[PDB]
Amino acid sequence: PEAYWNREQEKLNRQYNPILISHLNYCEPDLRVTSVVTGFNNLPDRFKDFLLYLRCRNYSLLIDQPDKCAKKPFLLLAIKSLTPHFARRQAIRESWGQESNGNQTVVRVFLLGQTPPEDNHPDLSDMLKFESEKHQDILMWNYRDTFFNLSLKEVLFLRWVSTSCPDTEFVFKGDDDVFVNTHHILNYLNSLSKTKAKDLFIGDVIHNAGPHRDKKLKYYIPEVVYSGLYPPYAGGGGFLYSGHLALRLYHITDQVHLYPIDDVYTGMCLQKLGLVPEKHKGFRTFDIENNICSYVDLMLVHSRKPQEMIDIWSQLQSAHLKC
Ligand SMILES: *[C@@H]1O[C@H](CO)[C@@H](O[C@@H]2O[C@H](CO)[C@@H](O[C@@H]3O[C@H](CO)[C@@H](O)[C@H](O)[C@@H]3O)[C@H](O)[C@H]2NC(C)=O)[C@H](O)[C@H]1NC(C)=O
Ligand SMILES: *[C@@H]1O[C@H](CO)[C@@H](O)[C@H](O)[C@H]1NC(C)=O
Ligand SMILES: [Cl-]
Ligand SMILES: [Cl-]
């Protein structure tokens, strides 16, 4: 196996089939990638950091909401966000991300990493703390919140679900620029039979995909780093799954090396469990933009601005009448 990820994952498979934890807590830079990865020095900076710190995922929680799931939630909303996105998070709080309760309790968390000053980010830590005290929906870990560290955001969130919210019935994970018709989510979840609910995982699933080889593309992956195809994976900006599956997914994450694209990593983890994400037409990653009617029978639409999220949500409340 010439590609680095394939070779490391293959060695990891041998580790987890022992005869008859250094890839999870080794947080010093793995200077070995310098020599074994051909052309390491001309790879972009994001690939260098990813390869160097691939074996470290024991990052701690700087901001936590321990009593978030004191009450068994029916649906846990887990929204990926960045420190400066105060308006996106607030618009979500006021529209589709509203918490609720009586057997259908809805709880909300925002998943943040660090935007550290050493990367020239403006110091917004005081406002972030003020926001966390006021809305109590901020979870923040001490890792650099970057594009290629989104798999870390995934794994660390699944860890938090395991320790702090293991009894949530269902989990929705999505981006902070996606509108979610949470009314339609709850209706769909309530309609599920017990067999389909237990290992539920639906989204905008992509089949027969592979790494983009064009260096200019955002999702570009060099052949040096990864070879082969991509598993079926839910992409876009949101997928929905059962809490039972989340607990299974987290325990398999140790057996799968982190991958630079977090959605592919989640698809990989599903493949390791022998599961297949289910494609649902209601997840329209793909839809630019009146027509409130499309919004009643959708589950989520990517993507929307803060103002649009509130505008669509207010309209959506009167849509059973109009549409
Ligand atoms: C994902 O997040 C982790 C956690 O923040 C990042 O790891 C950190 O990476 C930086 C490099 O940007 C490391 O800083 C370097 O440390 C060496 C130590 O000798 C120093 O010589 C350099 O000048 C630089 O300061 C930092 O140690 C490391 N932190 C931990 C806890 O491992 C990682 O880079 C992120 N990955 C991506 C792809 O962004
Ligand atoms: C991970 O664990 C090792 C060994 O316990 C520790 O030295 C390291 O600082 C930990 N990593 C982080 C990011 O805390
Ligand atoms: Cl502090
Ligand atoms: Cl914002």
Residue numbers in the entry: 55 to 74, 90 to 170, 172 to 359, 364 to 397
Direct quotes from the study:
β1,3-N-acetylglucosaminyltransferases (B3GNTs) are Golgi-resident glycosyltransferases involved in the biosynthesis of poly-N-acetyl-lactosamine chains. They catalyze the addition of the N-acetylglucosamine to the N-acetyl-lactosamine repeat as a key step of the chain elongation process. Among the characterized B3GNTs, B3GNT2 is the major poly-N-acetyl-lactosamine synthase, and deletion of its coding gene dramatically reduced the cell surface poly-N-acetyl-lactosamine and led to hypersensitive and hyperresponsive immunocytes. The luminal domain of B3GNT2 comprises an N-terminal helical domain (Pro55–Cys125) and a C-terminal catalytic domain (Cys138–Cys397) as well as an extended linker (Arg126–Lys137) that connects the helical domain to the catalytic domain.
